[PDB]
Each structure stands twice: as structure tokens, then as C-alpha cells.
């Protein structure tokens, strides 16, 4: 690949959308509404180790739902692709994030590991003797695939674990329905955790090129995941990653990605690159204005699109 | 590509599943219901223009859903992708093909030119000075992409327009929400009429080499779309080309694909093949059992996936 080129390519989409006004930050916790709300950045980490940024990007902003790639990662691993199709699923809900009538309408089934319901779902299926045992597997997960320095903000932890009322509700009716497989209050727990860590825009397109690389970390030079289960990751994120507009994803970028309330974005290239983006203004979809705009337009820029041959 | 190696893709998948148990026909009319359980075809119709095949792949079967990619892209070519994701849409309805809770829930949107509703819209949404001519252009891109034999059933057509009550009502909800582009009865008409056509399993592949080679059907080499109109074509099939197993089918084979309920099932690989199969015994999603499986079975022997490089 073209140094001059990716380097043109992220310094172009900061040039172009990195002041683009519209959105609001995520405001539910002091801490997500606090973050200054001009911060923006974006990346590319290659599946030959080389990074390009534009941008703040050592900020380190909250993971939150971004975390679903890498304990979805960690469960592939443990159970295998079958389970996880069985145990949480492969499909799209047509539905918010947070959505009860998803799930009550599949007969308390989750459908995708990545809205919240699947999730917790995701987390309490990750092999775990104990509640902490199964929170160190998961930091340690995201610690391989994003960069060693992610780390659990004991702030937003504290602020998440005494607001989520609604995550132990969804956890109860997993557990109703036979769709929890541990204890509902360590699920919410260790989800809520999870959630909780802060990385930069380099660290998460670090997490994109990890899964780029077939399942190598190109940093740490450190295969973390079974090559074989990575289709599966991509795929999950193709048809839930952006929620409700994922599908507007797809259709506008052609690339796997995923989104989090801390502002990032994240697009993988598959056998290429990671790509991301942050800025805390999200639209009403969750998803943030600037970082979908800034990825969009390296992808844009690169000619990157798994529909175009 | 190695011409030895697609035909014995081909012959696997045909030995292996042409004769695997399960569903049933579809048999809302009297032709579908009548069409030979038994009969299996599989085959691959490359972006060079070499065909490949195994089984009953003369047979020529009723087109259905498959139909609603046709028009799609005819859409996209007349009024452009920005009017088809604002008119019609680009998500997943998390819900099945004739859904109106679907509709209700999403303001009369359709979603997804995928499911019956959005399909019923954009059949209203292609330029046309009146029914007649409506049908006419439809017809022909059907025989520009798949074949030049693909033809109206009479007997298909005339069973489906007199059965065809809840889709009339699909046409008024979205005529009366907004998200109807002609008169509703012509709407109505034209989309069954589309449906009603019949094709084989050469045929199929065909419409899918087309759209791998991005625009261009290979065994006459026209071009019939424009290449930057496949890569939503493609993005629309990958969130809901197979209803509510879109997401399982993104999972487990990875390569964007469409269903109908004369037993076909078609996938595209960008940039190299058409992929088809059929078998009349649909399972409880409206998807070819068999069909499912040679499709599939092909592209893992391949080793075709859009998320892995």
C-alpha cells in the first residue's frame, strides 16, 4: 500500500468533516456528556503494522457498545460459530438497540450479539469459573485485539453500573427465556464493565485491523483470534454493527463496522485495513456524525467496498 | 479461474444435496404446488462468460421474489441510488416478507426493496408512461440480465392476480402513506406480473454473473447497468435478499444472495461468478432447502466469502 496515499486519505476526510456541525453527545452519564465535543479523529492501521492519523486521535473516549465485537470475538473462540448462531444468533432485529419487543417477538431470542439484549447474552456465554474470572477474559480480549493500554474507567463504570436499570431488565427476560447462561446480575455486570474501557482511534482501528489481518494483531505481531472465525465477526457487524442503519451502511460504504455513544466508529477492510474515526456528536441512531462521515470518506478515497469486485 | 475445479464444485454440490429431505413446495396456487418436488439443478456462470452445471438446470421455474432484484435495478438506473434509499430504503425489517406490522411501525416506510412492500414501491417508482409500458421495461431488463427467453406464465400470472388479496392491501398502505409512486391496482398488477415469469437455473446464474461483473451479462456482453449501481444492488440483497435468514446466510456463506418461491436461490461474488441452485421444497422462511445448500456448498468449496481476504 501507498504511505502518501493513506496518509492523504485520513488527512482529507479530518480536512473535509472534522468541524461538521450536527448531533449531540451521548448525555446519560456526566462523563459521555462532558467530553468536549469538538475532539475528532481518524485512522488507519494496515494489516502490515503501519498506522496513519489525522486528528486528536490518542484521545481516549469510552469503548461502550463497540466492546460487543470483542466479546462476540471471545465467544467464537470458546464455543465456536454454531453455538453462538444457536445461543445469541446471526440477524438483524429491525430494531433499537435497546428494543423489548425485538426479543419478545423471537420468543425471548436475542437474534445478533450486538444489540444490548444479545449481547449480554454474548458475555454471559464466554467460558468463566467466576464473575471476575470472566471479566478478566474479556479486558484481556480487548487488550490483544486493541492495544494493551484499554483500560476499565473506574468513572464510567461507576456512572453505567448505577444507571443501567434497563440492561438488568433485559437481563431477567434472557434469563426467563433460556437465553442467559450465567447468573442475570454477573451478565449485567461484566456487560456494564465492558463498556466501560477507554482506547483512542488508533487503538480501535487497531481492533479493525486485527480483524483485517484474519485475526492478527499487525502491532503486537500476535495471532488473538482463529482466522476462520473472523467471516463470522464481519459478518454480525454488517447486518447490526449501525443498529437501524446499518443497512445504510452497507449500502453507502460496503464495509463491516460498528459503532459506540463514546463517538467511535470503526470499518474493517477485509485482508487490508482498519479503519476509524471519533468524535463525540452521535445522530439519533446512536452513531457518531463526524466519525461516520470520516471513515466513509477514507473508504471513499481508497476505492474500499466488499460489493465492488 | 480454475475451470476444473468450478465444475467439480458444481458436481459436489448436486451429488451431496440434490436429494436431502425437507420442506415443502410452495402451494398458495396450483402451479407452484404441481412443480415436481424432486427436480435439482445447480450452477456457477462466470464474469468470463463460462457456464458450469448439474442436474435439472433446463428446468424453468417461476421467478417470485427474485424478480424484486430486476427492478431494483432498474430503479437505480432511472432515478439514481440517493432517490431509492429516500423512496424505498436500504435496512432490514427484522420481520417476514408480507410484514405490515413492518410497515406500521416504521411510519409506512418500507424499509427494503426486498421485502414485498418495499418491492410493491419500487415497481411504482420505475419511469413509465402508463401500466403497459411499466411492464414492458421490467420485462425486458428481467431478459437482459438472465436471458433472453425469460417469459410471462399466463397460467403463473393469471393464478397469482386473482390470490393476490394481501398484497393489494400492501399497495393501499403504501399508497396511503406516501410511499407509492403510481397508482395502487397498477403497482399491484405489475409486481405479480414480474413474479409470474419463468426462468432456469443457467438463467439465474446468469442474472448473478451479471451483477458480478458489474453490470455486464456475460454471455452476450451488453452492459445493462452501470457499475456503480451493482454495489447497491448487492448491499440490499446481503440485509434481506433471504427474509429473515439474511443475517444466517451472511453468517454461515458470506455472498450477498436472493430467494423465491419457485425454489431458486442465486449468490454473487463480485467480481467473478453467478452462483445458482434450485429445488421446489421451500423451508418455513420460503427458502429452497436444497437450493440453500448447493448454493452454499459451492462457495465454501471455492472458498468465496465477502468477509474474509
Known amino acids: 500500500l501507498d504511505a502518501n496515499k493513506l496518509q492523504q486519505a485520513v488527512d482529507q476526510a479530518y480536512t473535509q468533516f472534522?468541524?461538521?456541525?450536527?448531533?449531540?453527545?451521548?448525555?446519560?452519564?456526566?462523563?459521555?456528556?462532558?467530553?468536549?465535543g469538538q475532539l475528532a479523529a481518524v485512522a488507519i492501521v494496515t494489516c502490515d503494522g503501519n498506522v496513519y492519523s489525522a486528528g486528536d486521535s490518542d484521545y481516549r473516549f469510552a469503548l461502550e457498545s463497540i466492546s460487543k465485537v470483542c466479546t462476540l470475538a471471545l465467544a467464537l473462540e470458546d464455543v465456536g460459530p454454531q453455538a453462538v448462531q444457536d445461543k445469541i444468533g446471526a440477524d438483524p432485529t429491525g430494531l433499537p438497540f435497546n428494543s423489548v419487543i425485538a426479543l419478545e417477538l423471537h420468543?425471548?431470542?436475542?437474534?445478533?450479539?450486538?444489540?444490548?439484549?444479545?449481547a449480554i447474552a454474548t458475555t454471559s456465554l464466554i467460558n468463566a469459573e467466576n464473575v471476575e474470572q470472566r471479566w478478566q477474559r474479556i479486558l484481556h480480549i480487548q487488550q490483544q485485539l486493541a492495544g494493551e493500554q484499554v483500560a476499565l474507567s473506574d468513572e464510567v463504570n461507576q456512572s453505567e453500573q448505577t444507571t443501567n436499570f434497563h440492561n438488568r431488565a433485559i437481563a431477567w427476560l434472557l434469563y426467563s427465556a433460556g437465553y442467559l447462561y450465567c447468573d442475570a446480575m454477573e451478565a449485567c455486570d461484566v456487560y456494564t464493565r465492558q463498556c466501560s474501557t477507554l482506547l483512542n482511534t488508533?487503538?480501535?482501528?487497531?481492533?479493525?485491523?486485527?480483524?483485517?489481518?484474519?485475526?492478527?494483531?499487525?502491532?503486537?505481531?500476535?495471532?488473538?483470534?482463529?482466522?476462520?472465525?473472523?467471516?463470522?465477526?464481519?459478518?454480525?457487524?454488517?447486518?447490526?454493527?449501525?443498529?437501524?442503519?446499518?443497512?445504510?451502511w452497507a449500502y453507502r460504504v460496503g464495509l463491516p463496522g460498528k459503532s459506540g455513544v463514546g463517538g467511535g466508529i470503526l470499518a474493517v477492510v477485509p485482508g487490508v485495513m482498519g479503519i476509524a474515526a471519533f468524535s463525540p456528536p452521535l445522530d439519533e441512531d446512536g452513531n457518531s456524525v463526524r466519525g461516520q462521515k470520516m471513515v466513509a470518506s477514507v473508504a471513499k478515497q481508497l476505492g474500499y467496498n466488499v460489493f465492488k469486485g
Open 18 to 36: 472534522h468541524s461538521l456541525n450536527g448531533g449531540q453527545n451521548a448525555d446519560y452519564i456526566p462523563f459521555l456528556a462532558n467530553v468536549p
Open 107 to 118: 420468543g425471548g431470542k436475542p437474534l445478533s450479539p450486538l444489540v444490548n439484549a444479545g
Open 202 to 248: 488508533i487503538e480501535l482501528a487497531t481492533l479493525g485491523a486485527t480483524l483485517a489481518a484474519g485475526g492478527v494483531n499487525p502491532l503486537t505481531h500476535k495471532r488473538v483470534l482463529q482466522a476462520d472465525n473472523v467471516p463470522y465477526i464481519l459478518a454480525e457487524m454488517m447486518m447490526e454493527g449501525l443498529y437501524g442503519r446499518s443497512g445504510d
